[PDB]
Symmetry: C4
Subunit: 118 residues, 4 copies
């Protein structure tokens, strides 16, 4: 038998139970997004913690992050999206970074995963 | 006359007012448990503190600890229970350890005492 | 003109606005108490801070301190009360000390002043 | 494009988005106040932070500061107002300083800006 470690083991949602992500594994999750006609975006924030309220159901703190520049309307290659992750990690090297994807027909997001840790 | 010291004197419930526990005194409290047909178990946790809530009677925080592997269904000797307290204190040497006992006819616990301090 | 200093200037109630208290000034406030037939006592506590509650009038925290040994029933000289302030300040040298006085006809206190600071 | 910095960038209200204020720019904002017949004043405080309350609209903490000596009733030159900012910054060199101006016909304030930072 074995015991799961309960001390200082935080998780970060989707694809967080697999071995660490490498290049040529991130470039394939963007090709699958572009051939379905979706729009990428970027985000960053220093601390990923959440809070609550005394007696209000459905309320939590810490769900909004800062948008890098603007959504990329009309991108067709996976190069301009891979060259913008380096400018962001050289100006704010002490924060987290996330990648999103939008859909306008149904008005909902489609992807979210982390690519950098402080 | 004499004065009880009120500064930095925490207590830990049952058998916490007697001189410190030694071996050949822990092995006798497990013999008395096995001849009444009860099931041992183990637990651990870093901090033993409790909290409250504004206006909810009968609610407190800090009453659940983590379970080591599983309850021992069918133990008959006090050696296998005394050899499992050493594996636990070499993997997590900075936590508390407690020993419990179970009854399945009345569905309640019967014993609880501490055997290690950080 | 002059300005009262608003930074780090705590006060401690009665007789706290006069020059610092000396001996041959504490012994005279006990003679006045004994000739009116009152009973002395002692107290101590580490921190003199108070708190409140959200919506409960007339409730505050931090009004109870610890009693030294027992009220002195039958004291008639100001020597046994002046020899008990030295045993207390040699066992707990990092706490405050207060002196009280009781009345058993109207069931109220009569005086309270501080004689030691950490 | 460019990105506004969201980390450690506090603001201080009016005239806080301009280049830093210099002399001969502070003396010209007091001449405009005196020729409209208003009364100057001074204030100081260590920390400019605000708080809230659970469910009370229109309530905030941290809006009152300490008054230096008294309002100047009858000032006619901008010298006595510029010589009182040096006595205040030599007695409390670790606090903020703010300048006000009153009106008695309509009973409201008219000006507010910072002139010193710790």
């Amino acid at each position: 038998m074995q015991v799961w470690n309960p001390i200082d083991n935080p998780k970060f949602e989707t694809l967080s139970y697999l071995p660490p992500l490498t290049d040529n594994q991130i470039a394939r999750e963007i090709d699958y997004m572009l051939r379905n006609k979706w729009i990428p975006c970027l985000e960053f924030d220093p601390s990923g913690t959440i809070t609550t309220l005394p007696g209000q159901p459905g309320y939590y703190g810490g769900r909004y992050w800062t948008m890098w520049k603007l959504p990329m309307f009309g991108c067709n290659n996976a190069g301009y999206v891979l060259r913008e992750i380096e400018h962001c990690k050289n100006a704010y090297p002490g924060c987290f970074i996330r990648v999103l994807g939008f859909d306008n027909i149904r008005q909902v997001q489609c992807c979210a995963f982390i690519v950098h840790k402080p």
